[PDB]
Design a protein around this nucleic acid. Structure first.
Ligand code: ZN
Length: 226
RNA sequence: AUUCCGGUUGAUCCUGCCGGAGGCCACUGCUAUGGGGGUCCGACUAAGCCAUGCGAGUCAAGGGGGCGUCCCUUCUGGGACGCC
């Protein structure tokens, strides 16, 4: 329980500064699902470090893109690094962030922090015609997302079929806990930031579909942790 | 695998085409130890031209003959089974 020990260390050696951090410190909120759907603002990474400690794992942290941007001045070219990264345990929860820095290490650290701040909660299941099982191995139903010019449509896939999507989508879905999916993309997918944000938006939009109580049993819908 | 990646800018986002990555067929460089199965091998240009050999024969129980052998009456002439 190394991650539990890490969570406890973050709990004692930490002084909360926000209302949500105070709630976590005094124990009013004890589960990760309790900080969502209430309108709370997340501004302290210690909240995520305590509730969902697995996000600090090396295998649970992924660096998606590194870009070298240039700004022109009188003297010459000023170089900045933009790093797009994603974090989250491979079960129910995922987050994406962008960090800017003068050096790649600083940019990576800031991107990881912002991803932890931007963590969200998704829903999983099985809605494929060829599987019809009730395990949370895929998206429960077809979902859509978009950012910039990129439009991504995720379709449920049969169990045992790999993530049929680009590499960025593969990494994001693996971090989110999805194992099988089909994809249809339009627009400039070579724009890594837009592609990642579109996949993230689709995973978030999986929460925007109205469902009946029997659909949960039919598709094995699992919200958050399984 | 219902998928992407490189390229227009000092840097960014688009449209747009070009190129990478897979499968099948025809020529082709280098190289080569075997065995099975199949509906593969002058179709692409010339349905252009050909030496040579072969690629439609069979029937003697439809008919008259010729050669051979045998059995002979025994100059006569008769009967056969072989080949043409
Ligand atoms: Zn299934």
């Amino acid at each position: 329980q190394e991650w539990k020990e890490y969570a406890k260390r973050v709990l004692d050696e930490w002084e909360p500064k926000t209302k949500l951090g105070m709630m976590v410190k005094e124990g009013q909120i004890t589960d990760i699902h309790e900080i969502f759907r209430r309108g709370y603002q997340i501004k302290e990474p210690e909240i995520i470090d305590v509730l969902l400690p697995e996000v600090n794992a090396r295998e649970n942290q992924e660096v998606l893109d590194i870009a070298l941007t240039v700004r022109m001045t009188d003297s010459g070219r000023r170089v900045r690094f933009r790093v797009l990264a994603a974090v989250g345990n491979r079960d129910g929860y995922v987050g994406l962030g962008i960090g800017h820095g003068k050096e790649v290490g600083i940019a990576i650290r800031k991107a990881i922090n912002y991803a932890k701040l931007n963590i969200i909660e998704i829903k999983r299941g099985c809605g494929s015609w060829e599987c019809r099982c009730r395990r949370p191995h895929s998206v429960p139903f077809a979902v859509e997302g978009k950012e910039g010019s990129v439009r991504v449509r995720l379709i449920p896939g049969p169990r045992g079929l790999g993530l049929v999507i680009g590499d960025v989508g593969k990494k994001i879905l693996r971090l989110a806990g999805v194992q099988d999916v089909w994809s249809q993309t339009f627009g400039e997918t070579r724009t890594t930031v837009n592609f990642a944000k579109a996949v993230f938006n689709a995973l978030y939009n999986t929460n925007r579909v109205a469902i009946s109580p029997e659909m949960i049993e039919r598709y094995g819908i699992v919200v958050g942790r399984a």
